[PDB]
Symmetry: C2
Subunit: 79 residues, 2 copies
Amino acid sequence: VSKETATKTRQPRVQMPNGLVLMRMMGILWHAVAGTARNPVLKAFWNSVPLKQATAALRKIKRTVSALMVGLQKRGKRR
Amino acid sequence: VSKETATKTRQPRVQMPNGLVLMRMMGILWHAVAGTARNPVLKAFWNSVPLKQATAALRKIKRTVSALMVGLQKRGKRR
């Protein structure tokens, strides 16, 4: 549920599947470095983030975002 | 100065340099879908934002952030 994902993002006890948490970790860090947001339990999990497994997601999820970006451009001109 | 940029994130009159404003657009836009925070300044910038040229610039930065993670791995084990 997208409505749920939006609520779970930046919410205490973000203990969810690895494939889901690793899809929000960098998002939070993006604003954490230059902005705000620093939850105790979040920090603990972040300090426990694997090395190789992190890069594996970095080179995967980011590609999908790029694919969709160009994908929508293919349907920019209809009719 | 991260402390200086921090208070500029999601702040009105965010007329930052090309590479700087893009970094903000690649952050707040994500939160706008997974939460909230939709400033007219960003909406206007995104409205007139390039399509084909965007993917290229974004991918360029996507590499750097991922390279940093791998770079830290080479310094995870000190002595």
